[PDB]
Design an enzyme around this catalytic site. Sequence first.
Site, short mmCIF file in Angstrom:
data_model
loop_
_atom_site.label_atom_id
_atom_site.label_comp_id
_atom_site.label_asym_id
_atom_site.label_seq_id
_atom_site.Cartn_x
_atom_site.Cartn_y
_atom_site.Cartn_z
N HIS A 140 0.81 -1.20 0.00
CA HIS A 140 0.00 0.00 0.00
C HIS A 140 0.85 1.25 0.00
O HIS A 140 2.07 1.20 -0.10
CB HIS A 140 -0.87 0.00 1.26
N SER A 145 -9.11 7.95 2.06
CA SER A 145 -10.56 7.96 2.07
C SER A 145 -11.07 8.56 0.76
O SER A 145 -10.86 9.74 0.48
CB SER A 145 -11.11 8.72 3.27
N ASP A 147 -13.96 9.36 -0.14
CA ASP A 147 -14.95 10.40 0.11
C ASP A 147 -14.33 11.75 0.44
O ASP A 147 -14.74 12.77 -0.11
CB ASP A 147 -15.97 9.98 1.18
N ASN A 193 -8.75 -3.32 1.44
CA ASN A 193 -7.83 -2.45 2.14
C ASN A 193 -7.43 -2.98 3.50
O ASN A 193 -8.26 -3.45 4.28
CB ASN A 193 -8.40 -1.02 2.29
N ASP A 199 -4.73 0.42 -0.74
CA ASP A 199 -4.25 -0.83 -1.30
C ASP A 199 -3.82 -0.70 -2.75
O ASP A 199 -4.58 -0.25 -3.60
CB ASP A 199 -5.27 -1.98 -1.12
N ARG A 227 13.03 -6.98 3.85
CA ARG A 227 11.96 -7.49 4.67
C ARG A 227 10.64 -7.09 4.09
O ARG A 227 10.26 -5.92 4.12
CB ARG A 227 12.00 -7.13 6.14
N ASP A 229 6.91 -6.51 3.96
CA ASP A 229 5.83 -6.20 4.87
C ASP A 229 4.49 -6.69 4.32
O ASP A 229 4.28 -6.71 3.11
CB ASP A 229 5.80 -4.68 5.11
N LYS A 232 0.96 -11.42 3.43
CA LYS A 232 -0.25 -12.21 3.29
C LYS A 232 -1.39 -11.37 2.76
O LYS A 232 -2.51 -11.85 2.59
CB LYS A 232 -0.62 -12.95 4.56
N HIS A 233 -1.08 -10.10 2.49
CA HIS A 233 -2.03 -9.13 1.97
C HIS A 233 -1.77 -8.79 0.51
O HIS A 233 -2.40 -7.91 -0.06
CB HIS A 233 -2.06 -7.87 2.83
N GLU A 257 6.67 -10.83 6.07
CA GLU A 257 5.89 -10.85 7.28
C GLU A 257 4.52 -11.48 7.07
O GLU A 257 3.65 -10.92 6.40
CB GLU A 257 5.75 -9.44 7.88
N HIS A 327 7.66 -4.86 17.02
CA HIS A 327 6.94 -3.60 17.04
C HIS A 327 5.42 -3.75 16.97
O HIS A 327 4.70 -2.78 17.18
CB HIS A 327 7.43 -2.68 15.91
N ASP A 328 4.94 -4.96 16.68
CA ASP A 328 3.51 -5.20 16.57
C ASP A 328 2.88 -5.95 17.74
O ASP A 328 1.69 -6.25 17.73
CB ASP A 328 3.12 -5.85 15.23
N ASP A 577 17.68 -30.01 -1.59
CA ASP A 577 16.54 -30.05 -2.50
C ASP A 577 15.63 -28.86 -2.39
O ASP A 577 15.67 -28.12 -1.40
CB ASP A 577 15.74 -31.35 -2.33
CA LIG Z 1 -3.53 -5.99 -0.96
#
Ligand SMILES: [Ca+2]
Length: 686
Positions: A140, A145, A147, A193, A199, A227, A229, A232-233, A257, A327-328, A577
């Site tokens: 991202h 926003s 709007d 998002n 996103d 690294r 970030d 999985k997104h 991550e 940090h999370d 392997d």
């Molecule tokens: Ca995404």
Amino acid sequence: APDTSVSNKQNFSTDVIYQIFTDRFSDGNPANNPTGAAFDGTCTNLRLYCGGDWQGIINKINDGYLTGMGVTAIWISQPVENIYSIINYSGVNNTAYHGYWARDFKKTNPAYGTIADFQNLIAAAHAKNIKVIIDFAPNHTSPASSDQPSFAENGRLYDNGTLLGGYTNDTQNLFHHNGGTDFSTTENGIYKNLYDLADLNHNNSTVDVYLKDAIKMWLDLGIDGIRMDAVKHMPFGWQKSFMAAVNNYKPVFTFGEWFLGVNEVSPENHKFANESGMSLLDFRFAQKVRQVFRDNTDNMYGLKAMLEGSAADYAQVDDQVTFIDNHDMERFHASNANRRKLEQALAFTLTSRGVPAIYYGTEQYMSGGTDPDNRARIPSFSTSTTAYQVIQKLAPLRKCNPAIAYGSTQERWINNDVLIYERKFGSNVAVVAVNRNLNAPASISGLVTSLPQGSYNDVLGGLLNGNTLSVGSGGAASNFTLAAGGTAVWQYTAATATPTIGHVGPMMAKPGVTITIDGRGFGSSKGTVYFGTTAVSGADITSWEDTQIKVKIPAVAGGNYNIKVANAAGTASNVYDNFEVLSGDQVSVRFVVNNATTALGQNVYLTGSVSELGNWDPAKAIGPMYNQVVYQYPNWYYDVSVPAGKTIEFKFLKKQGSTVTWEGGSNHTFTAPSSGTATINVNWQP
Ligand SMILES: [Ca+2]
Ligand SMILES: OC[C@H]1O[C@H](O[C@H]2[C@H](O)[C@@H](O)[C@@H](O[C@H]3[C@H](O)[C@@H](O)[C@@H](O[C@H]4[C@H](O)[C@@H](O)[C@@H](O)O[C@@H]4CO)O[C@@H]3CO)O[C@@H]2CO)[C@H](O)[C@@H](O)[C@@H]1O
Ligand SMILES: OC[C@H]1O[C@H](O[C@H]2[C@H](O)[C@@H](O)[C@@H](O)O[C@@H]2CO)[C@H](O)[C@@H](O)[C@@H]1O
Ligand SMILES: OC[C@H]1O[C@H](O[C@H]2[C@H](O)[C@@H](O)[C@@H](O)O[C@@H]2CO)[C@H](O)[C@@H](O)[C@@H]1O
Ligand SMILES: [Ca+2]
């Protein structure tokens, strides 16, 4: 150069990462400090800028704070230019001090430093045998926003000063417009998002190519690792294409991550680490380590299960980046807890498989809750702490003991509160003992090791109540007492004569690329490298030595190969392997299939005439495909990494367990883009 050299941007198993929150580290240059409602030199308002910078890092790297510990790698916050706007989340002012709010990936964050400063950071570090890793968030831009285009910076994305587009009135379609994710499903958390962050749409050639160009810049700037970030997104296929971009240009150790919670075990996570081309942060390890040593919601048996399991799940468990906090999450150390728990976990981590990473301030016993309380300023640069010492004694082991670096793991003694394990690689051995029980000692009898006959002194020098070990014949150890909260590290090292492969990287790339093979017993004279049955010798072997080999990937067919080596004498090594030989340069393509009806529990997969597509093997088919965000059932889709400019024949199939159902009619066809992306829309053939 030895596998241990700082120049080895392909192997981090012998290193110790030190995670630094640039802003909260050290202010070496106040002239670059932000001003106004965005700045706070006292660092009481953890959501503002504190002054931390690259200059500061250099100073610490120069006065010996890091080197003294034994640290050999530093992971710093995202270097790129972040937004300037001071966001207001319910009366509270927030800034991009963290660096996860990208504005322009081709420029640096003025607060951290200038390009010149970054160049100085690299040299200072390199000169001190310290590797540099950088956080990178290509998922991202910033909080937006549609709007209220006035909100922050509308998630605006620049290309070195040139404005590409914004979240509002997104005609180019750079970002996603499917709402926010609830973390309900993988597909849900990928195409929606992440919070309120704009996103990025990787299916757009502009975004694709842009991020590809960006990363090269940093690569050219001398980084040693990356690294990723929020992996999985982002689409797995794209990421694969992104990794190849890296490996096919300037290979560097990359780990992403993939957030995992307590007792969470994802198969999607395993497959990612094994095929994506990148490794991952060991959340599995971290969570379990916390239950065991921290919260005490699991015992040694649970620790053993994790170790064994992981070793079976990850093709390359030694590439996984281990940790105890970050940090999370809440800082591992609680203000009222016993420090011995933190030291124990530290010892455990440092002597375990993977790549130890240490969140700044741990060595100082920093306590703190969740964001942003876990991101306080480093209170002191004292080397007098017990934690600082542990790291100092164990860290170096990863360099002098291949057993620690590439060694296997084996439980040798266990119980509710005690855990004794054996790391072993070649003629190298390391045995570690831990007794979480802070109030009870344990009698250890029946201990059997691979340690040679003799007496062994605690590597920790009794710092953690460790003791001396007496090993008779057969590795059988004499009965001893393991003190409450005790932790001992015994070891044995020796020269390895047989060629033993311990590491290989990159793990994915195309012919012509140079790969690095690390281990022991390679000999001084050039030998032979086997890519399956294909033999490689001579000039193609750029460099050969006892612990490292540099060889060009032969022009074999795309696919999965087994790597073996043989020394001059002709002696062959073990078989490494899971090495993937790409069909060529990669491009991210989106596959779509219409009117593909299935039964509950039955999924649609893709397969084709290329290794990147499984080579017609139903067992190696891409999938399962998605059907709920970008396209809805019975319409499936998927983002796949394929060889550019290649002509591919494909087909889809419905898989129920191992039961395969092939598409009817002839094979579909298409020619992949020689750059950027594309979408393939097709109907299911009956
Ligand atoms: Ca995404
Ligand atoms: O043997 C080497 C061959 O390799 C290549 O063949 C590919 C095909 O092009 C693909 O289509 C696929 O084959 C599937 C096929 O999709 C599917 O139709 C199916 O065929 C069934 C058929 O539906 C049914 O009527 C009956 O006849 O049984 C057939 C199964 O035997 O099953 C195929 C897989 O078994 O994959 C093959 C490779 O496996 C290449 O194109 C060829 O030139 C070459 O001969
Ligand atoms: O002696 C070999 C034996 O050692 C270990 O067993 C320990 C066990 O873990 C302790 O909890 C206790 O029961 O004493 C035993 C000593 O015999 C290993 O766990 C086991 O695999 C091995 O056979
Ligand atoms: O959403 C993923 C889902 O896809 C498939 O489920 C289909 C099902 O096959 C159809 O009969 C119909 O019920 O729509 C579903 C999509 O919501 C897979 O069968 C399933 O495993 C998977 O979760
Ligand atoms: Ca500063």
